[PDB]
Short mmCIF file of C-alpha atoms and ligand atoms in Angstrom, two decimals:
data_model
loop_
_atom_site.label_atom_id
_atom_site.label_comp_id
_atom_site.label_asym_id
_atom_site.label_seq_id
_atom_site.Cartn_x
_atom_site.Cartn_y
_atom_site.Cartn_z
CA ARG U 1 143.46 84.06 93.06
CA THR U 2 139.59 84.04 93.27
CA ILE U 3 136.48 82.60 95.12
CA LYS U 4 132.90 81.73 93.93
CA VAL U 5 129.86 83.73 95.29
CA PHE U 6 126.19 84.25 94.26
CA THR U 7 124.74 87.68 93.34
CA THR U 8 120.90 88.08 93.42
CA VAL U 9 118.10 90.68 93.87
CA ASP U 10 115.25 88.25 94.89
CA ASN U 11 117.16 85.31 96.56
CA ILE U 12 115.29 83.19 93.92
CA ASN U 13 117.39 83.73 90.73
CA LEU U 14 121.00 83.16 92.02
CA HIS U 15 123.79 84.16 89.52
CA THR U 16 127.24 82.46 89.86
CA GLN U 17 130.09 85.04 89.95
CA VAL U 18 133.91 84.53 90.28
CA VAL U 19 135.35 87.46 92.37
CA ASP U 20 138.98 88.69 92.10
CA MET U 21 140.00 88.88 95.84
CA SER U 22 142.37 91.89 95.14
CA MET U 23 139.35 94.19 94.27
CA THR U 24 136.40 95.31 96.52
CA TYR U 25 132.91 93.78 95.83
CA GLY U 26 131.99 97.38 94.81
CA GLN U 27 134.69 97.33 92.07
CA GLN U 28 133.02 94.20 90.51
CA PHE U 29 129.19 94.42 91.23
CA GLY U 30 128.59 98.04 92.41
CA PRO U 31 126.57 98.31 95.69
CA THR U 32 126.77 94.84 97.41
CA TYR U 33 125.12 93.57 100.67
CA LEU U 34 125.65 90.40 102.83
CA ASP U 35 122.38 89.88 104.86
CA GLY U 36 121.88 93.71 105.03
CA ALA U 37 125.56 94.50 105.86
CA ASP U 38 126.97 96.92 103.17
CA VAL U 39 130.11 94.98 101.90
CA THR U 40 130.61 97.35 98.89
CA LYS U 41 134.00 98.80 100.01
CA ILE U 42 135.16 95.46 101.66
CA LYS U 43 137.67 93.06 99.94
CA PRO U 44 136.36 89.42 99.73
CA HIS U 45 137.19 87.23 102.82
CA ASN U 46 137.76 83.43 102.34
CA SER U 47 134.66 82.70 104.55
CA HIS U 48 132.48 84.19 101.69
CA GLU U 49 132.86 81.13 99.30
CA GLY U 50 129.38 79.82 98.24
CA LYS U 51 127.39 82.59 100.09
CA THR U 52 124.62 84.77 98.48
CA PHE U 53 125.00 88.61 98.11
CA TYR U 54 122.25 91.14 97.15
CA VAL U 55 123.31 93.73 94.48
CA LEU U 56 121.77 96.89 92.88
CA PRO U 57 119.95 95.89 89.63
CA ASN U 58 122.58 97.09 87.06
CA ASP U 59 121.47 95.11 83.93
CA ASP U 60 118.17 94.31 82.10
CA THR U 61 118.11 90.72 83.61
CA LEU U 62 118.46 91.81 87.32
CA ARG U 63 115.90 94.66 86.66
CA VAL U 64 113.23 92.18 85.36
CA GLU U 65 113.91 89.77 88.31
CA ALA U 66 113.73 92.65 90.87
CA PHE U 67 110.41 94.19 89.61
CA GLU U 68 108.84 90.69 89.37
CA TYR U 69 109.70 90.23 93.12
CA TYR U 70 109.18 93.76 94.67
CA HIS U 71 106.69 95.38 92.16
CA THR U 72 108.83 98.61 92.21
CA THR U 73 111.51 100.06 89.82
CA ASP U 74 112.59 102.52 92.62
CA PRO U 75 116.44 102.39 92.46
CA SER U 76 116.90 103.20 96.23
CA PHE U 77 114.74 100.19 97.41
CA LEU U 78 117.43 97.49 98.09
CA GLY U 79 119.49 100.26 99.78
CA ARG U 80 116.68 101.15 102.27
CA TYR U 81 115.51 97.46 102.55
CA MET U 82 119.02 96.05 103.29
CA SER U 83 119.79 99.05 105.62
CA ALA U 84 116.56 98.23 107.62
CA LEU U 85 117.20 94.41 107.62
CA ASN U 86 120.73 95.07 109.03
CA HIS U 87 118.90 96.30 112.22
CA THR U 88 115.73 94.02 112.16
CA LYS U 89 117.81 90.75 112.20
CA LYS U 90 119.24 92.03 115.58
CA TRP U 91 115.74 92.47 117.19
CA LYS U 92 114.14 89.65 119.31
CA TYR U 93 110.75 88.14 118.23
CA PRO U 94 108.87 86.66 121.24
CA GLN U 95 105.67 84.60 120.57
CA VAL U 96 102.38 83.70 122.34
CA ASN U 97 101.09 80.45 120.72
CA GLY U 98 102.65 81.49 117.35
CA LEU U 99 101.60 85.20 117.58
CA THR U 100 104.93 87.13 117.12
CA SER U 101 105.65 90.60 118.68
CA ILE U 102 109.02 92.51 118.86
CA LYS U 103 111.04 93.31 122.04
CA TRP U 104 111.17 97.17 122.14
CA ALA U 105 114.22 98.66 120.30
CA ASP U 106 114.79 101.79 118.10
CA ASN U 107 111.21 103.13 118.72
CA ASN U 108 109.73 100.00 117.00
CA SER U 109 106.39 99.86 118.98
CA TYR U 110 104.29 100.91 115.88
CA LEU U 111 106.02 98.26 113.66
CA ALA U 112 105.42 95.63 116.42
CA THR U 113 101.69 96.59 116.65
CA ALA U 114 101.39 96.56 112.80
CA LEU U 115 103.22 93.15 112.65
CA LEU U 116 100.88 91.62 115.32
CA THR U 117 97.78 93.08 113.51
CA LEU U 118 98.91 91.65 110.09
CA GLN U 119 99.01 88.10 111.64
CA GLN U 120 95.27 88.24 112.64
CA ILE U 121 93.59 89.68 109.46
CA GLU U 122 93.07 87.83 106.10
CA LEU U 123 95.22 89.89 103.68
CA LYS U 124 96.78 88.81 100.32
CA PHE U 125 99.86 90.85 99.16
CA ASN U 126 100.71 91.36 95.42
CA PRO U 127 104.54 91.79 95.45
CA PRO U 128 105.81 88.18 95.88
CA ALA U 129 108.51 89.65 98.25
CA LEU U 130 105.76 90.78 100.74
CA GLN U 131 103.66 87.52 100.34
CA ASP U 132 106.80 85.31 100.86
CA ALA U 133 107.94 87.38 103.94
CA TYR U 134 104.29 87.52 105.27
CA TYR U 135 104.05 83.66 105.32
CA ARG U 136 107.47 83.42 107.13
CA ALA U 137 106.41 86.16 109.64
CA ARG U 138 103.31 84.06 110.67
CA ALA U 139 105.75 81.10 111.19
CA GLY U 140 107.97 83.24 113.55
CA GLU U 141 110.96 84.26 111.29
CA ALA U 142 109.63 87.86 110.95
CA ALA U 143 112.79 90.13 110.81
CA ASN U 144 112.66 90.17 106.97
CA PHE U 145 108.92 91.12 106.82
CA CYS U 146 109.65 94.06 109.23
CA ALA U 147 112.51 95.32 106.95
CA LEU U 148 110.20 95.09 103.84
CA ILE U 149 107.38 96.89 105.79
CA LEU U 150 109.86 99.70 106.69
CA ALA U 151 111.12 99.95 103.05
CA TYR U 152 107.64 99.83 101.30
CA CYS U 153 106.32 102.44 103.85
CA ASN U 154 109.54 104.49 103.24
CA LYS U 155 110.25 104.76 107.02
CA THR U 156 113.68 104.06 108.69
CA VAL U 157 114.73 102.16 111.86
CA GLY U 158 114.63 104.78 114.69
CA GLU U 159 111.92 107.07 113.16
CA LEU U 160 108.66 107.35 115.19
CA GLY U 161 105.59 105.91 113.38
CA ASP U 162 101.76 105.75 113.07
CA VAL U 163 100.08 102.27 112.81
CA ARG U 164 97.18 103.64 110.65
CA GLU U 165 99.64 105.42 108.27
CA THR U 166 101.65 102.12 107.95
CA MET U 167 98.51 99.94 107.21
CA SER U 168 97.38 102.64 104.66
CA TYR U 169 100.80 102.32 102.82
CA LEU U 170 100.76 98.44 102.92
CA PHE U 171 97.06 98.14 101.81
CA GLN U 172 98.14 99.75 98.45
CA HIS U 173 100.29 96.57 97.87
CA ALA U 174 97.40 94.18 98.85
CA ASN U 175 94.63 92.70 96.60
CA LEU U 176 91.42 94.32 98.02
CA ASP U 177 89.50 94.30 94.67
CA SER U 178 86.76 91.89 96.02
CA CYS U 179 86.20 94.34 98.98
CA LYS U 180 82.99 96.47 98.64
CA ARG U 181 81.32 98.94 101.08
CA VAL U 182 77.88 100.66 100.59
CA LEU U 183 77.03 103.71 102.81
CA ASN U 184 73.93 105.98 103.10
CA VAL U 185 74.50 109.67 104.09
CA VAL U 186 71.14 111.14 105.34
CA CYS U 187 71.06 115.00 105.34
CA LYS U 188 67.76 117.00 105.59
CA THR U 189 68.73 119.36 102.64
CA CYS U 190 70.87 117.07 100.32
CA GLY U 191 68.30 114.26 101.01
CA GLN U 192 69.63 110.63 101.12
CA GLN U 193 72.79 109.69 99.08
CA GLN U 194 74.11 106.09 98.60
CA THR U 195 77.86 105.71 97.67
CA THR U 196 79.58 102.36 96.75
CA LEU U 197 83.33 102.16 97.70
CA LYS U 198 85.95 99.57 96.50
CA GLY U 199 89.45 98.52 97.71
CA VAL U 200 91.26 100.39 100.54
CA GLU U 201 88.29 102.78 101.23
CA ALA U 202 85.90 99.77 101.65
CA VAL U 203 87.89 98.53 104.75
CA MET U 204 89.21 101.76 106.47
CA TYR U 205 87.03 104.38 108.28
CA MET U 206 88.32 107.28 110.50
CA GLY U 207 85.73 108.74 112.96
CA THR U 208 84.62 105.84 115.26
CA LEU U 209 86.25 102.67 116.79
CA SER U 210 82.81 100.94 117.08
CA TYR U 211 81.74 98.70 114.13
CA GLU U 212 78.29 98.31 115.83
CA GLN U 213 77.88 102.17 115.88
CA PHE U 214 78.91 102.53 112.17
CA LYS U 215 76.12 99.94 111.38
CA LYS U 216 73.31 101.98 113.10
CA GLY U 217 74.72 105.46 112.26
CA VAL U 218 77.34 108.15 113.18
CA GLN U 219 76.89 111.99 113.07
CA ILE U 220 79.28 113.77 110.62
CA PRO U 221 79.33 117.46 109.54
CA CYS U 222 78.00 117.85 105.91
CA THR U 223 78.70 120.44 103.09
CA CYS U 224 75.16 121.91 103.72
CA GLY U 225 76.16 123.44 107.13
CA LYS U 226 74.49 121.12 109.72
CA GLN U 227 74.77 117.40 110.72
CA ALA U 228 74.03 114.38 108.44
CA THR U 229 73.95 110.69 109.57
CA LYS U 230 76.35 108.22 107.80
CA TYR U 231 75.48 104.49 108.27
CA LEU U 232 76.65 101.14 106.77
CA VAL U 233 74.19 99.48 104.29
CA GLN U 234 76.34 96.57 102.96
CA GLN U 235 79.94 95.35 103.67
CA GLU U 236 81.82 92.53 101.79
CA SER U 237 85.43 92.07 103.08
CA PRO U 238 87.39 89.56 105.24
CA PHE U 239 88.07 92.34 107.86
CA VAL U 240 87.28 96.03 108.60
CA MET U 241 89.61 98.64 110.21
CA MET U 242 87.86 101.27 112.44
CA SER U 243 90.10 104.19 113.57
CA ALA U 244 89.51 107.42 115.59
CA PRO U 245 91.63 109.91 117.59
CA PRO U 246 92.98 108.16 120.76
CA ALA U 247 90.06 107.94 123.26
CA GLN U 248 89.41 106.02 126.52
CA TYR U 249 87.55 102.95 125.11
CA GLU U 250 86.29 99.68 126.72
CA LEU U 251 87.20 96.50 124.73
CA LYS U 252 84.73 93.60 125.44
CA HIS U 253 86.26 90.10 124.83
CA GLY U 254 84.91 88.24 121.72
CA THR U 255 83.46 91.48 120.16
CA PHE U 256 86.59 92.42 118.07
CA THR U 257 89.75 90.82 116.52
CA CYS U 258 92.55 93.17 117.79
CA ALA U 259 93.16 96.91 118.56
CA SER U 260 95.96 99.58 118.83
CA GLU U 261 96.41 101.57 122.10
CA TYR U 262 98.23 104.96 121.92
CA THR U 263 99.54 106.63 125.14
CA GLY U 264 101.15 110.06 124.41
CA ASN U 265 100.57 113.11 122.13
CA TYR U 266 101.38 114.27 118.53
CA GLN U 267 105.10 114.76 119.52
CA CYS U 268 106.08 111.54 121.42
CA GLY U 269 103.98 108.44 122.27
CA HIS U 270 103.93 104.61 122.63
CA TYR U 271 101.73 101.83 121.11
CA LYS U 272 100.47 98.65 122.84
CA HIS U 273 98.55 95.83 121.05
CA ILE U 274 95.28 94.39 122.55
CA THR U 275 93.95 91.10 121.01
CA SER U 276 90.92 88.91 121.96
CA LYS U 277 92.08 85.25 122.30
CA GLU U 278 90.65 82.99 125.14
CA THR U 279 90.78 86.23 127.26
CA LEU U 280 92.11 89.79 126.52
CA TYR U 281 95.90 89.98 125.88
CA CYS U 282 97.79 93.31 126.27
CA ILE U 283 101.13 92.91 124.32
CA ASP U 284 103.57 95.81 125.11
CA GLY U 285 106.47 94.58 122.90
CA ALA U 286 107.97 91.61 124.85
CA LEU U 287 105.68 91.99 127.96
CA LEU U 288 102.30 90.09 128.01
CA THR U 289 99.37 90.74 130.45
CA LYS U 290 95.96 88.92 130.52
CA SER U 291 92.64 90.40 131.86
CA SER U 292 88.88 89.52 131.49
CA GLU U 293 88.23 93.28 130.80
CA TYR U 294 90.26 96.20 129.30
CA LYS U 295 89.90 100.03 129.22
CA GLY U 296 92.55 102.38 127.70
CA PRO U 297 93.34 104.93 124.92
CA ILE U 298 92.36 102.93 121.75
CA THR U 299 92.97 104.52 118.29
CA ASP U 300 92.48 101.53 115.84
CA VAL U 301 90.12 98.45 116.14
CA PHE U 302 90.04 95.51 113.61
CA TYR U 303 86.89 93.32 113.27
CA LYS U 304 86.30 89.94 111.53
CA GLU U 305 83.76 90.23 108.60
CA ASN U 306 82.47 88.12 105.63
CA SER U 307 79.29 89.73 104.14
CA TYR U 308 76.85 92.06 106.06
CA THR U 309 73.55 93.57 104.75
CA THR U 310 71.66 96.10 106.99
CA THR U 311 67.95 95.80 108.15
CA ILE U 312 66.80 99.48 107.65
CA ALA W 1 111.09 86.64 80.62
CA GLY W 2 111.44 90.39 79.82
CA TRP W 3 110.12 92.01 76.56
CA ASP W 4 110.34 95.27 74.54
CA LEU W 5 107.48 97.62 73.43
CA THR W 6 107.43 100.32 70.65
CA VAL W 7 106.02 103.78 71.62
CA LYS W 8 104.74 105.81 68.59
CA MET W 9 104.37 109.58 69.37
CA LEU W 10 102.03 111.94 67.38
CA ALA W 11 105.21 113.94 66.47
CA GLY W 12 105.72 110.76 64.31
CA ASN W 13 108.96 109.62 66.08
CA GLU W 14 109.30 106.17 67.81
CA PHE W 15 111.44 104.72 70.67
CA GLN W 16 111.63 101.43 72.68
CA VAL W 17 111.03 100.63 76.42
CA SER W 18 111.96 97.43 78.39
CA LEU W 19 109.15 95.78 80.46
CA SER W 20 108.59 92.54 82.48
CA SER W 21 105.37 90.40 82.29
CA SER W 22 103.92 91.69 85.66
CA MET W 23 104.15 95.39 84.46
CA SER W 24 100.91 97.39 83.81
CA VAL W 25 100.20 100.99 82.60
CA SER W 26 101.76 102.72 85.69
CA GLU W 27 105.27 101.24 84.99
CA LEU W 28 105.07 101.81 81.17
CA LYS W 29 104.22 105.52 81.87
CA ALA W 30 107.11 105.54 84.47
CA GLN W 31 109.47 103.97 81.82
CA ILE W 32 108.32 106.56 79.17
CA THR W 33 108.89 109.31 81.86
CA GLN W 34 112.49 107.89 82.03
CA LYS W 35 113.21 108.29 78.26
CA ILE W 36 111.38 111.60 77.32
CA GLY W 37 110.87 113.26 80.79
CA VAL W 38 107.03 113.68 80.64
CA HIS W 39 104.87 113.28 83.83
CA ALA W 40 102.95 109.92 83.80
CA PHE W 41 99.57 111.75 84.23
CA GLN W 42 100.20 113.90 81.05
CA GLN W 43 100.47 110.71 78.83
CA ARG W 44 97.45 109.25 76.92
CA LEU W 45 98.26 105.64 75.77
CA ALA W 46 96.35 103.35 73.34
CA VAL W 47 97.12 100.13 71.34
CA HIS W 48 98.37 100.98 67.76
CA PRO W 49 96.82 100.80 65.25
CA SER W 50 93.53 99.34 66.74
CA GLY W 51 93.35 102.52 68.93
CA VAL W 52 91.76 100.80 72.02
CA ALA W 53 92.55 102.17 75.54
CA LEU W 54 94.79 100.41 78.16
CA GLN W 55 93.37 98.67 81.31
CA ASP W 56 94.77 100.63 84.29
CA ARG W 57 95.84 97.84 86.78
CA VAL W 58 95.68 94.49 84.80
CA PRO W 59 99.12 93.61 83.27
CA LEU W 60 100.05 94.57 79.63
CA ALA W 61 100.96 90.89 78.83
CA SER W 62 97.38 89.90 80.00
CA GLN W 63 95.82 92.38 77.45
CA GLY W 64 96.65 92.24 73.68
CA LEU W 65 100.23 93.61 74.05
CA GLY W 66 103.17 91.15 73.64
CA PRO W 67 106.73 91.48 72.20
CA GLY W 68 106.75 93.24 68.76
CA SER W 69 103.45 95.16 69.46
CA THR W 70 103.21 99.01 69.33
CA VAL W 71 101.45 101.66 71.53
CA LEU W 72 100.50 105.30 70.64
CA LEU W 73 101.53 108.05 73.15
CA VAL W 74 100.02 111.59 72.88
CA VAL W 75 101.10 114.26 75.45
CA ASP W 76 98.55 116.67 77.12
CA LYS W 77 100.79 119.40 78.73
CA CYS W 78 97.58 121.36 79.66
CA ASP W 79 98.25 122.77 83.18
CA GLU W 80 95.16 124.97 83.93
CA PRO W 81 94.71 125.94 87.62
CA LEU W 82 91.78 124.23 89.49
CA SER W 83 90.07 124.41 92.96
CA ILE W 84 90.53 121.36 95.31
CA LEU W 85 89.15 120.88 98.89
CA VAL W 86 91.43 119.78 101.83
CA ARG W 87 89.38 118.62 104.91
CA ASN W 88 91.01 118.64 108.43
CA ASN W 89 90.29 116.44 111.54
CA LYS W 90 87.34 118.77 112.52
CA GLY W 91 85.64 118.51 109.04
CA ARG W 92 86.25 122.08 107.65
CA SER W 93 87.05 121.76 103.90
CA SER W 94 89.17 124.82 102.85
CA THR W 95 89.62 125.69 99.07
CA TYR W 96 93.18 125.85 97.53
CA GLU W 97 94.11 126.88 93.94
CA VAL W 98 96.74 124.39 92.57
CA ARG W 99 98.14 123.01 89.24
CA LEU W 100 98.49 119.22 88.60
CA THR W 101 102.26 119.91 87.95
CA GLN W 102 103.00 121.27 91.51
CA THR W 103 104.24 118.67 94.09
CA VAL W 104 102.23 117.26 97.09
CA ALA W 105 105.03 118.91 99.22
CA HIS W 106 104.05 122.36 97.82
CA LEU W 107 100.35 121.59 98.70
CA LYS W 108 101.32 120.63 102.32
CA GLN W 109 103.13 124.04 102.61
CA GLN W 110 99.76 125.75 101.76
CA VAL W 111 97.69 123.47 104.13
CA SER W 112 100.39 123.87 106.89
CA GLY W 113 100.01 127.70 106.58
CA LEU W 114 96.15 127.79 106.62
CA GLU W 115 95.58 125.04 109.31
CA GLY W 116 98.71 126.23 111.28
CA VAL W 117 100.43 122.78 111.74
CA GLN W 118 104.10 121.82 110.96
CA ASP W 119 104.18 120.10 107.49
CA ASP W 120 105.67 116.85 109.01
CA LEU W 121 102.88 116.26 111.66
CA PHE W 122 100.15 115.38 109.05
CA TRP W 123 99.82 113.23 105.86
CA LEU W 124 97.28 113.66 102.97
CA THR W 125 95.09 110.89 101.39
CA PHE W 126 92.93 110.96 98.21
CA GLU W 127 90.53 107.96 97.90
CA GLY W 128 92.48 106.05 100.65
CA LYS W 129 95.82 106.40 98.71
CA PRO W 130 98.54 108.30 100.67
CA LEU W 131 100.03 111.32 98.75
CA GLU W 132 103.91 111.15 98.59
CA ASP W 133 105.64 114.59 99.08
CA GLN W 134 107.94 114.54 95.96
CA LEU W 135 105.25 113.37 93.41
CA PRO W 136 103.04 115.84 91.46
CA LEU W 137 99.28 116.32 92.26
CA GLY W 138 98.34 115.00 88.76
CA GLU W 139 99.57 111.43 89.61
CA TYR W 140 96.57 111.00 92.04
CA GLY W 141 94.04 112.11 89.33
CA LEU W 142 92.56 115.16 91.17
CA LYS W 143 89.51 116.75 89.41
CA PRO W 144 88.17 120.26 90.15
CA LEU W 145 86.52 120.18 93.68
CA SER W 146 88.00 116.69 94.52
CA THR W 147 88.38 116.37 98.35
CA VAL W 148 91.86 115.60 99.86
CA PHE W 149 91.72 114.40 103.55
CA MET W 150 94.26 115.68 106.14
CA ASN W 151 95.28 112.98 108.72
CA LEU W 152 96.99 113.89 112.05
CA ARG W 153 100.14 111.70 112.43
CA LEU W 154 100.53 109.74 115.73
CA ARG W 155 104.25 109.52 116.74
CA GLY W 156 104.68 106.06 118.35
CA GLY W 157 108.09 104.84 119.58
ZN1 ZN N 401 74.21 117.71 103.18
#
């Protein structure tokens, strides 16, 4: 005696299967998952009729479907994705006017900060899996997006994390081709040098949190011994990310999009999210606090941008 | 729809690889790696017989290549040592001798030793792309005197 189930890799192309109830799922499909739960070594229950199961791509059809969705051939992916999801569906996702954080659990503060950030910057993902999940995360059903973020970044539930590392890994899977940055580095021995950057490098800088400082110049050490001045000549992107080692920084309302606060060291630490709505919000996981002004250890600051040319 | 491509080698001998429409050069090289065990970065690919080079991020279906088309693979095993720079949080570029065949992991070992930091408390980037431990240096297209950035890893829970 048998039941009817669906096997898939994308939850788009569903394949009708008839399962012998005497054998494990594993004995018929190889590695098999029900909403992230590993049901490989489990015999089919009656309550499984008509339900969808994810499986390891194990034929040239499933392989095509899977790459078209995830943009990876990596055989471990559904393993690490489904393993993450199995935890992320059990987290709570509190909102403030549609902005979705995560109640603290399994050291998830960095994920929560990343998740909040992603909802406030104009970003277009390439793997349909990320784009689909990204649109459902903005709507409030965000557990799936978090599991994909963990998998793509190759981190696990429980592991400590860095928000800048995470955005760096994700930005590789985003279309940033239209993004362009032009800098001038002004030494006294090299002279003046103008470099044009594209993609990820056009939107991330590590050295200062201030966008207004980067526009009128920052001191960096040069190859030629002493100190050159780097400044921003032209910028064409929907946002910019400005990062620097955690430092006591004042965030003025209306002068930035959102920012990451880091309290701790290079062993253990904790992230809070600060965003500029009608006033300044401080979102520590589930807890929300409003203030007209904010000072604290900021490490990452996101700004809104369209097209900037300098006057120098 | 999936589709099959013919890879002609300069040894003369052919084989077949399975693609999907959204696949570009990276995945072809990764599929060739599968069948003949040659690092992606050591493969030069061009349309056969026209002999025009492949566009690096636009899909293969978008370019000339469709089902029944052929591509020429030639293999540059050249593994000469080269000098690369690895800059820390301060700004001090230090020079390391490496080969494009040795893993990012092996490079972190060297940088961990010289900068005196546990290998798992920093990550490396080249041109904004994170370097993954298990992959070889060649994948990230490092030239002689290319500058790898060392990033101190925050540990947020
Ligand atoms: Zn100089």
